[PDB]
């Protein structure tokens, strides 16, 4: 027999993601680089591995949308809600949605896609928000021009372990 | 930091259920009998007890539906997905949904509602799938042809690991 | 070439319906009789014909549900919203949903399924609400213990014609 | 009584569009060029003009999406449904959605975005499907292999029946 796990977490270390569509705001290459770096934040401190799929169903489906986009969490135009992601699970579990009524960037202007995506993928992997104001998972955006804070390291390792500590 | 903790078991032994709607495929009394027997599989071997409510909110809300039916885990027409249930917890926790594009039966012409529901309620109570091919919680449907059902030992051990014996 | 029609209406006279699931409140036969009579209200004054399908995709998919049930119009528990239906069109177009937190009846008590369904199927066929307080499509429920009012006759015939006037 | 009247044409000749997001399959500039050319098919033969907006609400909102994407007209994975568009009117009226489980191309390897979009925008402007197999508005996709596209006479006549000649 099997009882359920104690937390929402992926039961496998090899996870896939797919960039379903792209923002007008950045080139395809810049978006890809941002998401690759954002996953690396987490793979650098766990045994997780992330691979990109170009098509089909990936664990973590990433998309840009506005207003109603296929779930119970419609976006709200400029400002306000920026992005959301579902905890580990089937179907929409893991998926990350970005509000394209925001301006996404690879700079200090607008919202830096890398930084916001790194937070979103924390949710995709099983972290909720933190009360540590220095944490990546603290739900207030501050631009930094990157080292994963220790609160986030401790949280993600509580779920997956550290992987190679080197 | 925070994770998304799972409720590993119901913290009360007296649970309620409600049959929100009914399949075209069986009479009301047939459906009621199937679900009553499916709960009894589990209450017979633990301290759990189940009470039916006719109105309002119950711990285990049971419904029949097709395609997209309110949780963004859509069903898929005949065959494939049969049913799904949520693990213990508030709101959708415990609830069980049956794909009415299947043919539900009190016998063998289609999927036996009692047997499928008994498996679903295992999930509602905290059991994941078993790897024992003879277990109720094994995720391949078979039918013995016999008028009596005996809960396999693997399932007895699993549910008693959570709730103890009756 | 073809431009679109001037109103939302079915472009065919042979329409199908499917009772996807059933209320706890009434027997299957009573529900079927109510819906058959409710369609007859409209077929008696137009060239429309209604046939019931037991499975598969019908034009008018009828279901009973509560709270979130797969669209943008969640139900609201007892009282308040009773039912809604979509105007003619593909997919959910035509479909009729009944809130099973109401008590549906074949009497003067609760909400008479026949009477409410007859109004809902007016929507399914292309009528919005009327300002004639005597109309079936007036959106306030009154029990009657049936003759389709003339405002509704005029409205439905404006879309489909009268069929056989005998 | 009231029916659900359709808007048979836009009542202004100056329309706006917005490309809300972008397919992985083509560069931003390729997508922009395809949509610009698709609008020009129609503006070249009528008094219509089209202006691109980068932010906010536009008459014709264009997006790429997969599966359930916010309107309960879900896409279906590769092949089958390609795209859909809403007829003239407020809110979703005019908007066009492209299934990104298709491969969109500037050429012939997949579905040519320009050609499919030109058909979609015919719907956005008030045209239904043609029965002429040589029409742009005929709902079977073919590709000529030629570098130039000429709007067929059937489509010219259809769109000019609504808006007149340019
Ligand atoms: C008031 C708070 C709870 C609302 C948070 N927002 C949402 C959030 O935490 N998304 O992950 C929440 C409504 C689910 S947010 O859209 O403002 C947001 C999104 C991504 C972020 C990434 C880094 C830093 C802050 C962020 C804030
Ligand atoms: C590929 C497998 C894991 C998919 C299982 N299926 C679902 C399930 O285990 N539901 O409890 C799974 C997608 C969550 S199933 O719908 O095929 C199903 C449902 C009830 C069953 C009851 C008894 C026996 C088999 C069953 C199979
Ligand atoms: C305040 C009004 C507009 C809300 C109407 N209601 C809804 C309606 O007209 N459904 O057809 C409306 C929210 C779309 S209702 O649920 O109260 C309702 C439903 C069926 C009915 C059938 C016969 C008579 C009245 C009815 C009222
Ligand atoms: C069975 C048919 C009516 C389904 C049409 N399809 C849809 C359509 O006509 N969209 O404009 C229909 C379901 C609303 S389609 O997705 O196969 C499609 C879409 C764009 C097209 C553009 C050019 C040529 C063909 C096309 C076919
Ligand atoms: Ca690692
Ligand atoms: Ca926003
Ligand atoms: Ca997912
Ligand atoms: Ca943007
Ligand atoms: Ca199924
Ligand atoms: Ca529940
Ligand atoms: Ca069925
Ligand atoms: Ca008739
Ligand atoms: Ca209600
Ligand atoms: Ca329908
Ligand atoms: Ca009821
Ligand atoms: Ca498709
Ligand atoms: Ca629009
Ligand atoms: Ca694509
Ligand atoms: Zn979302
Ligand atoms: Zn967050
Ligand atoms: Zn469900
Ligand atoms: Zn299962
Ligand atoms: Zn509904
Ligand atoms: Zn109404
Ligand atoms: Zn759409
Ligand atoms: Zn079309």
Which structural technique was applied? X-ray
> Atom 1 of ligand 2 has which residue's CA nearest to it?
B139
Number of C-beta neighbours around residue D146 at 10 A: 7
The Cα-based distances of B71 to A58, A108, B75, B93, C67 in angstroms read 20, 38, 10, 12, 11
Q: Which two tokens stand for residue C125?
A: 């066929």
Cα distance between residue A144 and residue A112, in whole Å: 9
- Resolution, given in Å to one decimal, reads 1.3
Cα distance between residue C59 and residue C86, in whole Å: 11
Q: Which ligand is nearest to the CA of C18?
A: 14
Q: Using CA atoms in the order C143, C145, C150, C156, what is the torsion angle rounded to 10 degrees?
A: 70
Ligand 20 centroid from CA A119, angstroms: 6
Report whether D119 belongs to an annotated binding site: yes
Q: Which two tokens stand for residue A155?
A: 């949280």
Please report where in the chains the tokens 């049913």 appear, as a residue: B83
Instruction: Return the closest-CA partner of residue C133 out of C154, C157, C149.
Output: C149
Q: Which two tokens stand for residue B23?
A: 């399949």
Q: Which two tokens stand for residue B131?
A: 């790897």
With CB atoms and an 8 Å threshold, state whether A23 touches D22: yes
For D151: left if phi > 0, alpha if psi spans -120 to 50, otherwise beta; the answer is beta
Q: What is the 3-state secondary structure (H, E, C) of D3-25?
A: ECECCCCCCCCEEEEEECCECCC
Q: Report yes or no: D129 and D159 within 8 Å, Cβ to Cβ.
A: no
Cα distance between residue D43 and residue D46, in whole Å: 5
Q: Report yes or no: A34 and A40 within 8 Å, Cβ to Cβ.
A: no
What domains sit in chain A, N to C, each tagged with a CATH number?
1-166 (3.40.390.10)
Q: Is D99 helix (H, G, I), strand (E, B) or coil?
A: strand
Q: What kind and span of H or E run contains A61?
A: strand A60-65
SS3 percent helix, strand, coil of chain A, rounded to 5, is 25, 20, 55
What are residue C111's DSSP bridge partners?
A: C104
The Cα-based distances of C48 to C16, C87, C165 in angstroms read 10, 16, 13
Q: What is the largest CA-CA distance in chain C?
A: 52
- DSSP at A3: B
Establish how many alpha carbons lie within 13 A of residue C136's alpha carbon, considering only the half-sphere containing its beta carbon. 25
Residues recorded for chain D: 166
With CB atoms and an 8 Å threshold, state whether B127 touches A155: no
- Secondary structure (DSSP) of C12-73: -SEEEEEE-SB-TTS-HHHHHHHHHHHHHHHHTTSS-EEEEESSS--SEEEEEE-S--SSS-
How does B5-42 read in b/e, with b if 16+ C-beta sit within 10 Å? ebeebbeeeebbbbbbbbbbbbebebbeebbeebbebb
Cα distance between residue B59 and residue B90, in whole Å: 8
> Atom 8 of ligand 2 has which residue's CA nearest to it?
B84
Instruction: Return the closest-CA partner of residue C97 out of C119, C65, C68.
Output: C65
Report whether D84 belongs to an annotated binding site: yes
Establish how many alpha carbons lie within 13 A of residue D92's alpha carbon, considering only the half-sphere containing its beta carbon. 14
Number of C-beta neighbours around residue B64 at 10 A: 30
Q: Report yes or no: C152 and C130 within 8 Å, Cβ to Cβ.
A: yes
Q: Using CA atoms in the order B138, B142, B144, B146, what is the torsion angle rounded to 10 degrees?
A: 90
CA D75 and chain centroid, separation: 16
- DSSP at B126: T
| Residue B60 to chain C, least CA–CA distance (Å) | 14
Q: Is C111 helix (H, G, I), strand (E, B) or coil?
A: strand
């Amino acid at each position: 027999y099997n009882v359920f796990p104690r937390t929402l977490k992926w039961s496998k270390m090899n996870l896939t993601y797919r960039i379903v569509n792209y923002t007008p705001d950045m080139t395809h290459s810049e978006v890809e680089k941002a998401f690759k770096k954002a996953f690396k934040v987490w793979s650098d401190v766990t045994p997780l591995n992330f691979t990109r799929l170009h098509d089909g169903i990936a664990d973590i489906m990433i998309s840009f949308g506005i207003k109603e986009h296929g779930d119970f969490y419609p976006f709200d135009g400029p400002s306000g809600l920026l992005a959301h992601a579902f905890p580990p699970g089937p179907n929409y579990g893991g998926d990350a949605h970005f509000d394209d009524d925001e301006t996404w960037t690879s700079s200090s202007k607008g919202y830096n896609l890398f930084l916001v995506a790194a937070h979103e993928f924390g949710h995709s992997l099983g972290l909720d928000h933190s009360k540590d104001p220095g944490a990546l998972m603290f739900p207030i955006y501050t631009y930094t021009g990157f080292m994963l804070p220790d609160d986030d390291v401790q949280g993600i390792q509580s779920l997956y372990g550290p992987g190679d500590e080197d």
